[PDB]
């Protein structure tokens, strides 16, 4: 038993059927967007129908929104002639052809690698337009080539999500150390931090082991441990967006010429960060308010394209200050059946 | 709300036979229908989740199918230990009330039970082990004698969402102590309207792979 | 220098619709250019016949031009630093209104 997702035009008979709503990638290869279209024989000369896969990228900041400019670009646009008035098919496409009928025209897209995943920036209450981020869309045009204008009635628009999952290899656990020499003679202060693991799932607790060796003439006042999320925007040379999604301040003090080891638990979640405008979250379809953006994996030997999301645990000690950063990956694992891509309890 | 109809009301078959149970929904549910089972004196256990996808930890004899709105649960062989009460649940929409419940015939810890005054406040404590409140959604479901399970409360700490049934709205408060990694349920009510045993179950936080783990529960008598 | 300053002013005024001018800060660039023009005017105040009025004018103009230029530079670099730092600790939207 298998089921597909169908999108129908407001007018006429133009129905697009897609097997799955998520098209994941394995760095080396990307799952192809395979689907079918049913179009009624309502045309006389316009016997050409096109399918366009567009990886649109939009961005807007608070200062830019106030000024009145919002960046927009098309990272990758692929056009395929669905109707052949070569191109191997799949078992799902063959089953769709058999069930739908002879009019079922297939279309297959092979998404090239080194493309950003579907990540949408969280919009504030003021923003009411298109979602800011990278969105993958499939648009069906029943018109004579691309010369004619795009018609809302004829075109079928369906939002698809390209996401990555946690790698099979967990990777070495982060372990970051920093020794600082104070201006008062040669008095070294040592800080070290370690994580339970390198790959982290959304909602899972994060355990950080922090050890401080004070050989100075000052006492540490407070320790701030935060989970910074960084959103590198390669296009338009936009400045890096850094946002603390979780924080913990400890008033404990460490005496000079003494050692102190402790463990801290930080669990990032969206409820506390719901008011952070511009935060990068997972791909959205109809404003479902998905989880935090899964940290993209740059396994390629590394291209400046789209939005690159990363997470780092930052530990800061005051009395200047000593700051250390431990990168970690906050990515969803491979789901058993499929990602629902929506709030499972609708109400 | 969406009401689920479960048939047959009572079923009896020989050991090793094939038993088919039908579940009809009020409207379309987008195949977000699960099948649970419970034994007398025992907490319910999930059997089938997410449109006939078998859950880990249960025998492969159980199978599911979906024909439009109708859902079918098929048991190829009726094992001697496979004599339990089956329920059909839909979690596509809130409320997530279960089905009528069919009968077949030939970690989480809950506390806070005991004698209850006719009108007053009750507190139920749910100790959770092996998982975090931000990595799962905590639900509280009551079961009254002579009737099946009924969804009552749901809390999702990751999204900060809370949901209550219409019959319990305005009087039920559910909280998740992340530091203590536990759940608290406060119910200020009157009479014996909520004289039922309460189970503290959990579901996957994001994809909601059914109510896999169910609490033992404690008896509440008004 | 005055010719270059007026040329840059005219270029920015004509190209006010480009994204670069808007993002760089129209107000800050305009006031910095005004300060640069004031400096190029004050250049020849010293090279003249000294009078008490001219002495006062040259000292006041030099001070004011330096203050204008370097305060515009401070505002520009502060906007740049606020944008670069992203969301500050304990805040949600620390963006600087232009």
């Amino acid at each position: 038993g298998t089921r597909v997702f169908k999108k129908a035009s407001p007018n006429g008979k133009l129905t697009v059927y897609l097997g799955k709503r998520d098209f994941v990638d394995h760095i080396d290869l990307v799952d192809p967007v395979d689907g079918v279209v049913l179009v009624d024989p309502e045309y006389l000369k316009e016997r050409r129908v096109y399918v366009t896969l567009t990886v649109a990228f939009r961005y807007g900041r608070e200062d830019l929104d106030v000024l009145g400019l919002t960046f927009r670009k098309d990272l990758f646009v692929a056009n395929v002639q669905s109707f052949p008035p070569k191109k191997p098919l799949t078992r799902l496409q063959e089953r769709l052809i058999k069930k739908l009928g002879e009019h079922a025209y297939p279309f297959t897209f092979e998404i090239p690698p080194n493309l950003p995943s579907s990540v949408t920036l969280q919009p504030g209450p003021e923003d009411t337009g298109k979602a800011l981020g990278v969105d993958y869309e499939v648009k069906a045009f029943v018109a004579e080539n691309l010369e004619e204008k795009i018609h809302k009635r004829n075109s079928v628009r369906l939002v698809i999500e390209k996401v990555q999952y946690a790698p099979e290899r967990p990777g070495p656990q982060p372990t970051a150390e920093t020794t600082r020499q104070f201006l008062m003679s040669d008095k070294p202060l040592h800080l070290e931090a370690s994580l339970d693991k390198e790959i982290y799932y959304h909602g899972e607790p994060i355990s950080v082991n922090v050890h401080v060796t004070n050989n100075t003439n000052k006492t540490v006042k407070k320790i701030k441990i935060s989970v910074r999320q960084y959103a590198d925007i390669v296009l338009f040379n936009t400045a890096q967006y850094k946002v603390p999604v979780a924080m913990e301040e400890a008033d404990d003090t460490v005496a000079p010429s003494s050692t102190f080891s402790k463990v801290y638990t930080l669990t990032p979640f969206l409820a506390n960060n719901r008011e952070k405008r511009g935060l990068a979250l997972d791909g959205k379809l109809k404003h479902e308010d998905t989880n935090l953006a899964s940290s993209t994996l740059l396994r390629e030997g590394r291209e400046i394209l789209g939005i690159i999301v990363s997470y780092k645990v930052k530990v800061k000690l005051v009395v200047s200050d000593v700051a250390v950063e431990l990168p970690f990956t906050l990515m969803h694992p491979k789901p058993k059946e499929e990602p629902p891509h929506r709030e499972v309890p609708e109400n | 709300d969406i009401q689920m109809t479960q048939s047959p009301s009572s079923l009896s078959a020989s050991v090793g036979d094939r038993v088919t149970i039908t579940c009809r929904a009020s409207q379309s549910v987008s195949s977000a229908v699960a099948w649970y089972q419970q034994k007398p004196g025992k907490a319910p256990k999930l059997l089938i989740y997410s449109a006939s996808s078998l859950y880990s930890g249960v025998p492969s004899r159980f199978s599911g199918s979906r024909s439009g709105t109708d859902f079918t649960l098929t048991i190829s062989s009726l094992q001697p230990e496979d004599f339990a009460t089956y329920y059909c649940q839909q979690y596509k929409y809130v409320p997530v009330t279960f089905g009528q419940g069919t009968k077949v015939e030939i970690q989480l810890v809950e506390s806070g039970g005991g004698l209850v005054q006719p009108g007053g406040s009750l507190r139920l404590s749910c100790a959770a082990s092996g998982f975090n409140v931000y990595s799962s959604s905590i639900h509280w479901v009551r079961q009254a004698p002579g009737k099946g399970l009924e969804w009552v409360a749901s809390i999702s700490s990751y999204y900060g969402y809370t949901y209550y049934a219409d019959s319990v709205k305005g009087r039920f408060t559910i909280s998740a102590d992340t530091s203590k990694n536990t759940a608290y349920l406060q119910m200020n009510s009157l009479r014996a309207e909520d004289t039922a045993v309460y189970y503290c179950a959990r579901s996957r936080q994001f994809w909601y792979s059914g109510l896999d783990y169910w609490g033992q529960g404690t008896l509440v008598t008004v | 220098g005055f010719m270059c300053t007026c040329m840059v002013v005219t270029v920015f005024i004509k190209h006010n619709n480009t994204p670069l001018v808007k993002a760089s800060g129209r107000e800050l660039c305009y006031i910095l250019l005004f300060g640069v023009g004031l400096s190029y005017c004050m250049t020849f105040f010293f090279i003249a016949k000294p009078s008490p009025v001219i002495c006062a004018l040259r000292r006041l103009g030099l001070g004011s031009s330096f203050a204008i230029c370097y305060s515009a530079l401070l505002t520009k670099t502060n906007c740049i630093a606020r944008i670069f730092d992203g969301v500050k600790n304990g805040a949600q939207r620390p963006k600087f209104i232009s």
Partner: peptide
Amino acid sequence: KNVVTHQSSASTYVPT
């Protein structure tokens, strides 16, 4: 280089 720009859903069962 200084430029800025450059019905409802449904489901169905397909038998194997």
